[PDB]
Copies of this chain bind each other. A is one copy, B any other.
Amino acid sequence: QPFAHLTINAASIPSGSHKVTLSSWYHDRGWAKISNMTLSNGKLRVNQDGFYYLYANICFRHHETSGSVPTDYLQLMVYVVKTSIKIPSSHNLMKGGSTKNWSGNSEFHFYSINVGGFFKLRAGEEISIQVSNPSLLDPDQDATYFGAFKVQDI
């Protein structure tokens, strides 16, 4: 059956603050793997109908530079998006995260988000990950990844 476990591609990670689509993942190294699904710049395309279980783990991290601001109210969020094929439409399957105050009092900061769901997918539909503050992403394969594996037929 079809599956996928895509780990973040460090080399390609935007340096912004607002929402962005993570458009670069590994699919054939370390734990990264893909079967009967296709990947193209962050978009995981479904080839075979079925009920899939979808999951995503995202880790944020940062180091406060000497002489940091008294406060830094961040929104660390993840969104798992599905793009329909039979009709142009993008919608959030799942979303998670939290607000954080990563001021300068604490030198280091870490935080990870985990979302998981059971959804009905069709061939042609694409799955993509969206996050805020992508510049704070942890590049490790055990830290930032998302996957999917078919469980039942439709």
Contact = CB atoms under 8 A, between A and B. Distances in A.
A95 B1 contact: no
B96 A112 contact: yes
A59 B51 CA distance: 24
Contacts of A95: 59, 112, 140, 142-143
Report, as a range, how many residues of chain A touch the other chain: 35 or more
Given A57-B116, A115-B57, A118-B55, A142 B94 contact: yes
Nearest to A73: B106
Contact of A112 (B98, B106, B108, B119): B98
A64 to B, nearest CB: 11
Task: State the number of copies, please.
Answer: 3
Given A5-B119, A120-B33, A99 B109 contact: yes
Given A75-B110, A98-B112, A51 B149 contact: yes
Interface of A: 1, 3-5, 31, 33, 51, 53, 55, 57, 59, 71, 73, 75, 77, 79-80, 91-99, 101, 105-106, 108-120, 140, 142-143, 145, 147-149, 151-152
